[PDB]
């Protein structure tokens, strides 16, 4: 499912991401835009053999199991395929664990390079929240 900007903001807000760990809603929507272009079915394989899944491109090396990333962890306790669902619940719950890990949202390099320090509030402007 390809989400609309405001449609995703509302879905994330409903799942408790607004201000989660001090990160305003604009930050999460911006991260999703550049990580997957709002597409829940997005996947990208990395040089180390791991693969990123879903709207927030969560990595298989540590957070989910895809059965093909040798010596990987499954800290979110979910099959990676569950992160490609049109229902973002699984992605959201796992993202909350990731952002609490220690480096905050810096864990997402697209956020660090394209959202961090910018006017992220622009990502939710015009939305009925």
CB 99 within 8 A of CB 23: yes
Token output for 80: 């990676």
25's CB contacts (< 8 A; 6+ apart) are 9, 12, 13, 17, 18, 19, 123, 124, 129
Phi and psi at residue 24, to the nearest 5°: -65, 155
3-state SS, residue 13: helix
Beta strands in the chain (DSSP E): 43-45, 51-53, 58-59
87 labeled binding residue: no
Q: Enumerate the active-site residues.
A: 35, 52
Binding site for substrate: what residues are annotated?
Answer: 101
């Amino acid at each position: 499912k390809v989400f609309g900007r405001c449609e995703l903001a509302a879905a994330m807000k409903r799942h408790g991401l607004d201000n989660y760990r001090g990160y305003s809603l604009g930050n999460w929507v911006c991260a999703a835009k550049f990580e997957s272009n709002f597409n829940t079915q997005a996947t990208n394989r990395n040089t180390d053999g791991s693969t990123d899944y879903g709207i927030l491109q969560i990595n298989s090396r540590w957070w989910c199991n895809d059965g093909r990333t040798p010596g990987s962890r499954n800290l979110c306790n979910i099959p990676c395929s569950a992160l490609l669902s049109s229902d973002i619940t699984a992605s959201v719950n796992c993202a909350k664990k990731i952002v609490s890990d220690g480096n905050g949202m810096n864990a997402w390099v697209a956020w660090r390079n394209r959202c961090k320090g910018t006017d992220v509030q622009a990502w939710i402007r015009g939305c009925r929240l």
